[PDB]
Amino acid sequence: AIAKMRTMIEGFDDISHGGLPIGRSTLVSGTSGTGKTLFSIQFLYNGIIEFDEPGVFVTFEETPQDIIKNARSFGWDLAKLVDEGKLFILDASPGFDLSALIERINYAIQKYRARRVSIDSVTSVFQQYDASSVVRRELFRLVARLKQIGATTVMTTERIEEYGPIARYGVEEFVSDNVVILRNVLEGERRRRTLEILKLRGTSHMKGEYPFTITDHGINIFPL
Amino acid sequence: HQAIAKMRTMIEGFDDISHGGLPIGRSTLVSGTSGTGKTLFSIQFLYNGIIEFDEPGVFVTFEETPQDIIKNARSFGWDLAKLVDEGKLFILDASPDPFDLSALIERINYAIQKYRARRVSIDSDASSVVRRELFRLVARLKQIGATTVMTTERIEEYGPIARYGVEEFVSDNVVILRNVLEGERRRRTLEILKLRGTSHMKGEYPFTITDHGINIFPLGAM
Amino acid sequence: QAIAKMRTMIEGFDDISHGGLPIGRSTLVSGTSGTGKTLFSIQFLYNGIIEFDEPGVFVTFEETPQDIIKNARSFGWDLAKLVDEGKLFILDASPDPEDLSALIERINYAIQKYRARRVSIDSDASSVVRRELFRLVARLKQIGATTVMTTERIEEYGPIARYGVEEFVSDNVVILRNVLEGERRRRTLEILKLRGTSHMKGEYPFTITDHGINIFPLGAM
Amino acid sequence: AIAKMRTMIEGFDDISHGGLPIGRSTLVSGTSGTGKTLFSIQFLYNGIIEFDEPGVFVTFEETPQDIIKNARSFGWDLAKLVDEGKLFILDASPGFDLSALIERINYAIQKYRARRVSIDSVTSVFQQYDASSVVRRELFRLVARLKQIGATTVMTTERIEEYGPIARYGVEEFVSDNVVILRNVLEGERRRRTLEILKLRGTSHMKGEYPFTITDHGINIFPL
Amino acid sequence: HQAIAKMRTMIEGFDDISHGGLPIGRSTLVSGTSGTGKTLFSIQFLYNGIIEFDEPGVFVTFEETPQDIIKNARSFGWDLAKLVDEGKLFILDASPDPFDLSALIERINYAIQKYRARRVSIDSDASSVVRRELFRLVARLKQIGATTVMTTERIEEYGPIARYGVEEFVSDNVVILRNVLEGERRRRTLEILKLRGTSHMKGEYPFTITDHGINIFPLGAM
Amino acid sequence: QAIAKMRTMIEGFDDISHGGLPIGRSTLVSGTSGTGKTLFSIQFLYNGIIEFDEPGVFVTFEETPQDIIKNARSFGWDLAKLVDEGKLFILDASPDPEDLSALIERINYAIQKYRARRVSIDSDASSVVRRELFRLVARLKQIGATTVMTTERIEEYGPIARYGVEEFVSDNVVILRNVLEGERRRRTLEILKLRGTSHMKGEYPFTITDHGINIFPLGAM
Numbered sequence A, D: 001a002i003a004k005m006r007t008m009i010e011g012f013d014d015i016s017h018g019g020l021p022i023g024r025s026t027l028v029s030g031t032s033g034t035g036k037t038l039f040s041i042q043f044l045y046n047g048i049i050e051f052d053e054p055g056v057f058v059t060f061e062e063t064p065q066d067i068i069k070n071a072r073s074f075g076w077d078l079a080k081l082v083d084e085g086k087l088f089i090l091d092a093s094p095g096f097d098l099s100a101l102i103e104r105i106n107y108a109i110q111k112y113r114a115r116r117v118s119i120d121s122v123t124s125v126f127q128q129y130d131a132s133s134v135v136r137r138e139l140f141r142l143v144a145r146l147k148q149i150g151a152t153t154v155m156t157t158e159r160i161e162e163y164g165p166i167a168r169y170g171v172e173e174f175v176s177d178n179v180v181i182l183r184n185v186l187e188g189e190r191r192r193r194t195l196e197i198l199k200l201r202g203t204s205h206m207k208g209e210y211p212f213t214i215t216d217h218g219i220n221i222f223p224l
Numbered sequence B, E: 001h002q003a004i005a006k007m008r009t010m011i012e013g014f015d016d017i018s019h020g021g022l023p024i025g026r027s028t029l030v031s032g033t034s035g036t037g038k039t040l041f042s043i044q045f046l047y048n049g050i051i052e053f054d055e056p057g058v059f060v061t062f063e064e065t066p067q068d069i070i071k072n073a074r075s076f077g078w079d080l081a082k083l084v085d086e087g088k089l090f091i092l093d094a095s096p097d098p099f100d101l102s103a104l105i106e107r108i109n110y111a112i113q114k115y116r117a118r119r120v121s122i123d124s125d126a127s128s129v130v131r132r133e134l135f136r137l138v139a140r141l142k143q144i145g146a147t148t149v150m151t152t153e154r155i156e157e158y159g160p161i162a163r164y165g166v167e168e169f170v171s172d173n174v175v176i177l178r179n180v181l182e183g184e185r186r187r188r189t190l191e192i193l194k195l196r197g198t199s200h201m202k203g204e205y206p207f208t209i210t211d212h213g214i215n216i217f218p219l220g221a222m
Numbered sequence C, F: 001q002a003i004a005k006m007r008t009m010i011e012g013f014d015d016i017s018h019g020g021l022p023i024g025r026s027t028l029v030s031g032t033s034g035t036g037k038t039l040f041s042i043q044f045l046y047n048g049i050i051e052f053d054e055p056g057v058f059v060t061f062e063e064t065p066q067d068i069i070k071n072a073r074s075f076g077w078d079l080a081k082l083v084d085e086g087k088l089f090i091l092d093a094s095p096d097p098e099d100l101s102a103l104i105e106r107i108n109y110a111i112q113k114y115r116a117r118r119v120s121i122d123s124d125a126s127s128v129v130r131r132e133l134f135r136l137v138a139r140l141k142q143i144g145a146t147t148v149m150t151t152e153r154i155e156e157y158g159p160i161a162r163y164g165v166e167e168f169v170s171d172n173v174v175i176l177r178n179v180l181e182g183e184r185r186r187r188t189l190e191i192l193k194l195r196g197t198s199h200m201k202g203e204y205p206f207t208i209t210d211h212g213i214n215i216f217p218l219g220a221m
Ligand SMILES: Nc1ncnc2c1ncn2[C@@H]1O[C@H](COP(=O)(O)OP(=O)(O)NP(=O)(O)O)[C@@H](O)[C@H]1O
Pocket: A030, A031, A032, A033, A034, A035, A036, A037, A038, A039, A073, A074, A214, A215, A216, F167, F168, F169, F170, F192, F193, F194, F195, F196, F197, F198, F199
């Protein structure tokens, strides 16, 4: 019914029954340090390395140089992909309206013939601009235009509780076709990472929380 | 003359729980957190009305495009495109362009009249204003004579019925879809909280979503 | 010397209240949605009429008279007949799709016109709510009405009613609950308070059936 | 160290080690239907019957006629005490300033030579007048002037949780010399009434919750 | 030259828990719900300073009148009237008449100078403003060289340290008095949360209030 | 290729962080009152100076330099000597009893003057807080400083910091807890996150003694 794109992130394409729905956005929400940026980098990296699908990474608060430096933790050379024209890192770092940003993103997608897009994290621009009032409207604008473009998008968001609202403004999951929750639960002085696919409109997926670890090779999910 | 009559949904298990289906000529609120099956329920209500009883339906969408409603319904082997082309289903696009309630209600009445519709699904910041506006909608749908499913959002599995804390009190009928997380596993359940002027089963009934749509099971099952 | 009470004839209730509702006073009936508030308030009037020939005035704020009448047919009650016979008056204060003191005067006009002994009223700042609810309860008391007034609440074991004041201005308070535990619902009724008189304490389970509300003994089911 | 006045309410003078501190105010707080008005009526009634100490009852929302009628539940004839000049029921029923009310109360105390005063409930006037802003200030005014007068006062207040703040505005206990909490706890579908003396400045008292019942004879506390 | 020195309170048990008493020349916040023993603690601090060490004290009261402070202290057999008449204790009446902080601080400094006081007790709506103003007071008391107990209110036994959520962060030293209700019984406990630049015992220590004042006991006692 | 780290020499910490704090970045250290935040931040500079001759700048917002110095004598540290020798600079931003970008320029002036490699910063609308904290972290990064910045929180197992944003703009996050259970306190340290590198997970108990912070093994005591 709906076609999916392989993420090649260990375990994820099993949990999602094939990968992420093509041409749609997937919200990846989680508290700080849960692995959201990593998930969004792996998504682009694997598309390039495994499938020669170019990617655009939109960063708000982290600098492109820090994204590149941090990815060396995993032995991934993103500078080389940028040099080869296969990755573009769009720096979106400092009435509220995402129209201008959407034009920039669209330019990059057409220029680099990108099939994958990662946006990390649009929560920060809403919050820095004090734009909670229009989050539902502007996220809708962004999600809708990315769909018109045909991009397959990972969109990260913040949340402040492990078991609580999906995201910070309490509306983000409802305008998203697809929702993944990363958790980092503290119990008995120990942390455990888990991943959940809450929803994929129009298709099936495994349910509940699945454990994962972050290693030198990135995210490893165990699809019990 | 007699107590209220019901219209069969044909959603497996639901007509048992509702003691006959949804109260005719009224609206039923179906509330749930994200991914609980709300849009599915409202689609299945229309689809079954068309296939089983040749009762035309109007689907009102506020954020999903008609194309995506049609695409997603193929997950269950339902061909909504065929139904739209036969004039049995009309998808009213009220989604924004990548709010006027009176204008909306007029469009809905227009569609109900044009397509002879007997079923309607509507899917989906002061609580005082929400109460007044939802009341107007419910009341005018009842004047038109529609049997309606209207979905609403909620945030917590075992908190308020719906986002604003008022929606269930202006509704005649309320169904709650939950997606309960316990010990890392999810369990879907459906509950008929209330049907004014008629009987229904009580409590949460477990259900699944499969290639066949929603299938509801007996109490404490699964 | 006690407070005089009028029988509700609602199965079990007149035992729990030790004689029924205090006459000439208002009783708050609070509950989450679908707990039986409107039913309790209709059954109070209906029984008043059928058992005692005591006329009743039903004040509706959101449901229409025709829907009230239709819904009561669930219980085999013919409210339309009672309106035709002048025994029941349904005052429609529900808004048209498409002022407190004024409403009170229409209520009093109805009470005097129909010589009603029973009144049911069904159903954003706590200060204003407290002041206006006090004026309504006080005016009904001066009129001599015995009143059931319903209110909303949003949690089964939280505040008595939405604004956190409603129970303090009421002489009498009844709480209807619909408790969800282990995927099952259990309806319970509690008389929290009756000023000046006695009543059973705590929660009593009840059912709603074809014959209305039926309240059961302690710790039952 | 500080002299106390017997309440003669069954069990209470044991819990308070002698009764209420003379010349001071005692806050009696509780959720609705916990017995606050009853406690405040018994305090005056017993002063009159047992000790020929006249009393003034200040009522805000309940009418004097209802106070009198309700007290017949217990076989107490308050109309007769009013007729004999031993009880005065002051009807205080409908910038915020209790000065005028305080003058009325003072007039009644002097006129009737009252030793006991019950005020039930000043919470309602604060709330009806939307005067949360000045609760601490105005309660202080009232408590201080009653102390200057020499009255021994029971002052009831509302609260909305059994285990939670002492009173509605979160300040009332701090301007009171003495604090009593009435609770009506629901557990396992059963209610239990308890009374606690939280604090009596400058003197001793029993601690914790003590069970009580309300009967035809009024409040019965069991001072375990 | 060396780490901070302490002044003995002589409150039974307290100087053990504080590893020597209260840090000299600083303020110690003593926070508690109503009836926890805050005023008692602050009175005992001065009284013991006078009786045991001939160190004069100033008591600043904001709501209890001096007459009532004196009256209530007779519960413990303490004759504060005698101490005021000997010029060893001064009760500064800052209570309202049945707010100017700079003016208050000047009066406190005046009293400290007039009576040669070495100990001070102060007893007792935007959190930002409270933070700034409390900071000014603490800082100016430290400039004067007072060793001070300052009491504050709190609402919950195991919630915020104090009413506004900022008071402990501008204090050098924090003591929490609790009155914990469990199974219908109350248990009083005292905790030294923090003393900057010095050591102290940790956790809650049970205490009683009796005719002798506050008596603190070893851990897990009673 | 890893992220380079600088050793804190705080007992146990450099093991938990797998080498120390990421160089040229800021580390958030959040905690309720009296959890050891100022101590952690002083020990970071002190060890930098004593172990590695790396000068440090301490920015204080409420405690005075003289109190910082007095309090450190608890640990047998002579900070006054280090200020005299030009190895430690305490920037006083505390208010006098009786503008972000400006503060940043005074910090940078201090860093350049004293050739500091280490910086500690100690310590009402979430939007504004997020924007200003981002500007500070970004400017410190451009300057090249390795920074410890303390923040407050009010619950041991609640939000990381007061405004619910502080941890998201930080590259590195450490949480100090002081957990009260059964009338006993237990101090724990947690490294929540270090962008781009590895670290041990969960809570590690620690003590504060005459020698500063000592962090213990897993599940200890
Ligand atoms: N080589 C590695 N081995 C193990 N864990 C690693 C490694 N590199 C990074 N990590 C972990 O990955 C985490 C970073 O994940 P990241 O994807 O930046 O989280 P995030 O959710 O985007 N954080 P934030 O943006 O602040 O909300 C670090 O906190 C480390 O715990």
